Amino acid sequence: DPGDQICIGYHANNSTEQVDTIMEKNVTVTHAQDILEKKHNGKLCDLDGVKPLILRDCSVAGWLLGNPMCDEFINVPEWSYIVEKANPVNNLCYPGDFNDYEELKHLLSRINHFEKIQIIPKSSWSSHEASLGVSSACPYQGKSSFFRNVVWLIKKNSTYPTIKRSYNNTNQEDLLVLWGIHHPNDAAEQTKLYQNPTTYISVGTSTLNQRLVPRIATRSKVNGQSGRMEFFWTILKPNDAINFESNGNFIAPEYAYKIVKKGDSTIMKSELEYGNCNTKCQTPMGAINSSMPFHNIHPLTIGECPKYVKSNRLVLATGLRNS
Amino acid sequence: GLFGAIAGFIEGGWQGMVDGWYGYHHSNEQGSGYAADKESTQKAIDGVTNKVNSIIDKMNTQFEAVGREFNNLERRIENLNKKMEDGFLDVWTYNAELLVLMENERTLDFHDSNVKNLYDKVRLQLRDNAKELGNGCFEFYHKCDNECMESVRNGTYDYPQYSEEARLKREEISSG
């Protein structure tokens, strides 16, 4: 008679999941786990319901200096991350330079609210022309103007007295102070805006000893202006003051920002826009909401985010070869 | 694979087996069916889950890039930043891919080992009382009823009871 039979073997199911090994690839398996995510919404979102600071076509310089076109940001709320275009076009309206701009942006990567306070009022300029510092390269509404947070002081009558102003951080939070120097094309322009021909700017703090002198040269009409405007910045510790003393080519700090919230943030070089959303992970290419430990979207991420690998397929085999 | 069990002397899988990865198929006078060895399947489930989570936790400490800017006279340090943040990415992507490949090959052969171990286990309990067909099955010289079947499965095969019976039944196979 045919005998009873015990047999030994394994399980097979309808899984078309394939996994790769060192010797064999595309091995069909009973159970597998994809460990890599490849899905993004394609739009900037809140992070912990905290809105991003979408600078749009404006730059960090124009936003902090007060470019007439960046007036949309005159008052910004708390942000999780700034979004700045690669080549923002609302930048220095008056051609010039920002001393250690990239460093200032690296410090901005660690802030999460700035409060703008008028350090020196624009009406505090009795000996000098305050509202005469407007230019055609900085248009606010098809008429002329300048950076809002800074004042382009100009001689009164035909006399530009020595400015000797001082501000003490009575505030317990550190302050961000920003000033500037106009570098004109000829000595006639010099004496026209600032009577005194030889001019100097003296900025002094506990860690600052600054003796600037305008550089007059035949430069070119960038933005229609051959003159330049070099901008400088520094951080004021509490119980600490900044002293300005200048006789010409002085761009006076009107507004200054305090570091009220020093959290964690980034500068996202992305051309996307706010999409009325909130996610736990944000990339320059979109937002990710994946429990998978890995991702392949963008190496620069913000928030609770997966790890980034430059791979296209990552699946772990959890079962055995399928029939 | 390394143990010759899956895709080897057991050339196929059981779609009818549903409750486990490894198990047995019986075919006695009373019926034929599939049962699953719950012990080996669990042990494998536990080991596999622990392997995945360990891999994930080891990967969790992985370099994370930060964005920085360098002016047109900081080209050398910009190149340094670029090459380093990408070299860490290269090293880490390799690490992940290679680990996946290796640990998968080892998971597959772990399943192979489990199947071969269970096969040898019952080959050792079913002694001269059973003929080894080679396809992954054993033919009982003495007829093994459902309870007798589970005895083989659960590991409580009281050989001596069927020892005399299957010895007498082997006598006839020995004399034709």
Binding site: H31, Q33, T318, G319 | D19, G20, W21, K38, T41, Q42, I45, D46, V48, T49, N50, V52, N53, I56
Partner: peptide, 15 residues
């Protein structure tokens, strides 16, 4: 992390 193999049959470890 729990992949949940053979549900209602085995206690996948890890939570």
């Amino acid at each position: 992390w729990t992949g949940d193999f053979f549900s209602s049959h085995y206690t996948v470890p890890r939570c």
